[PDB]
Every structure is written in structure tokens, then in C-alpha cells.
Amino acid sequence: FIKDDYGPESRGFVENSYLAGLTPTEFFFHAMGGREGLIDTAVKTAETGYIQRRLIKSMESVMVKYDATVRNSINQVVQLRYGEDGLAGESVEFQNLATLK
């Protein structure tokens, strides 16, 4: 390419389809694009797993006692009722408040 070429072809735009095949310059640019996603896949896990473990170790002992209150291992009260309502999260549904609007 000419120096200082800002056109679509000179900066990565691929005007061909996967049925019509790619020109060599477009092929290399497409490789450059796919490399970025392939790198992020490996990099992301080392952060997500660390965040996962760190989150769990802080809350691992919080449970619902027989008062229906939510306490940690040292009986400090976190929530008076689980979720502000005392209901399990796997039996609820999306609904509409008819009287609001």
C-alpha cells in the first residue's frame, strides 16, 4: 500500500464473502482479527477464575438459619429475610403490575 492510505481496503475492510474467498491482503488482515479473539480467550480465564474463587471465599459461610434470617458463621445478621422477601429464587416468575400504568 501507498503511505497514508486510509481507504477501506488499506485498513482492513473485507469486501469479499467466505464463498468468494479472500484476497491475500484481506486474508492476512482476517488472521490479525481472529488472533485477537483467540488471545482474549486464554487471557480472560486467569482473571475470571481468580474473581470466582475470591468471591466465594468471602460468602461461603452465609446461610439461612431457622429464624428465616440470613447470618454468617459468627451469627452476625446480614439480612433479616433472604432476598428482602424470604422466598427462594427458583420458584418466582416474571409478571406485570396491572394497576401501575
Binding site: 452476625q76 445478621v77 433479616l80 432476598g83
Partner: protein, 209 residues
């Protein structure tokens, strides 16, 4: 520069009156919500070299349930107030029967005067505020829920109801703006009412520590 300072002084007085009303002291409805014009006309529109000198704005208020416990507020003229400038207020405080007062400083207070406030606490429970800190009623913000100061009998009933000791409650430090705005010591439970998107309303309690 006088209109800005007058506006700044009017807002400080308005927030102070709102604070006194929320804290339980008796304040007339006229003073609770007065426009800038009444303030401008009352005290004279001249913050620098004029009639509305920072001496001349002291609110002496009295509690609702008897007119004996009374609170002053003081707006010192010096930017950085010191011990010599707070002993005058201490002399005024012992001269009267009043037991607590507020100081709204223009700049930060010297550490020596802060120690003086601390070490006289049991006799006179007086605290400080910053002028910049008092230009907005932070209780009006949408993030801050409703705060209520529980009474000792109510706290005893609550602990007996849930059968939990004092230290098992969630706690709030005495230095955060809301607790400071209400002026509450440690070992004083605070009710917090907030709207809950799951249940409707939710009531929580915070023990000052």
C-alpha cells in the same frame, strides 16, 4: 463578590434549619422554608463589611418535648478556627444552661481545637461541620434512604424480639455523613427504611460503632 456569599450563607442556614427539624428540635414553619428574599431583607445583603456579619446568625433552638435542652450553632469569622476562638463559645456555653452546640467552620479546624472538642465531650457534647459539607441536605438525595433514630426502649424491644445480642446487628460508623448529620453517639441503633424492588419495603437496623 457578595451575591454568591449571600446565596452560600442562605443555603447553609436552610440546611441547618432542616437539620434541626430532623434532629427533633422545634423550628417554626416560616424559618424552615424561607426564600432568599426574606434572608436578603432580614439580614441586609452585605456578607463582607456589613450587617450580616458571621457573629449575627446564631440559631438558638430548643427541643420539642421540653424547652430546657437547647442547641446553639456558631459560624466563626476566622477561616481556620482555633482554641482561643472556641473558648469564647465554651464561655458562652457555661454562661448559659445549654449543653450542646454546633460549629460550622469555613476552613478545616486545627487539630488542637479538635482535641479540645473531644476531651470536654461528657460535659458538652458539641460537634463541628464544614461550610462546604453543609451546602446540600444529603438526606434529600435519591440514594440515601430514610433514617430514624431508635429509642432505648425500642432497641430493647427489638433485641428481645429477634433474640440477638447488641453486636450481632449490622453496624454503621459514627463518622459517616448521615450519622454525623443526625448527631448520634455509639451504642445507638438506627432504623433504615428503604424501598425494595423484591418485597415492597424493607426495614434494617444499624448499630452505631
Amino acid at each position: 463578590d457578595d451575591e454568591e456569599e449571600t446565596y452560600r450563607l442562605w443555603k447553609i442556614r436552610k440546611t441547618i434549619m432542616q437539620l434541626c427539624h430532623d434532629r427533633g428540635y422545634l423550628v417554626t414553619q416560616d424559618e424552615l422554608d424561607q426564600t432568599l428574599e426574606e434572608f436578603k431583607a432580614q439580614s441586609g445583603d452585605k456578607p463582607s463589611e456589613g450587617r450580616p456579619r458571621r457573629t449575627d446568625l446564631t440559631v438558638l433552638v430548643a427541643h420539642n418535648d421540653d424547652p430546657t435542652d437547647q442547641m446553639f450553632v456558631f459560624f466563626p469569622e476566622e477561616p481556620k478556627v482555633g482554641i482561643k476562638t472556641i473558648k469564647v463559645y465554651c464561655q458562652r456555653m457555661q454562661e448559659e444552661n445549654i449543653t450542646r452546640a454546633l460549629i460550622v467552620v469555613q476552613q478545616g479546624m486545627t487539630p488542637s481545637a479538635k482535641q479540645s472538642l473531644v476531651d470536654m465531650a461528657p460535659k458538652y457534647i458539641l460537634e463541628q461541620f464544614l461550610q462546604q459539607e453543609l451546602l446540600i441536605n444529603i438526606t434529600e438525595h435519591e440514594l440515601v434512604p430514610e433514617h430514624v433514630v431508635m429509642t432505648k426502649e425500642e432497641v430493647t424491644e427489638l433485641l428481645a424480639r429477634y433474640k440477638l445480642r447488641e453486636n450481632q446487628l449490622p453496624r454503621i460508623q459514627a463518622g459517616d455523613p448521615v450519622a454525623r448529620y443526625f448527631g448520634i453517639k455509639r451504642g445507638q441503633v438506627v432504623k433504615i427504611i428503604r424501598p425494595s424492588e423484591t418485597a415492597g419495603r424493607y426495614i434494617t437496623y444499624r448499630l452505631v460503632q
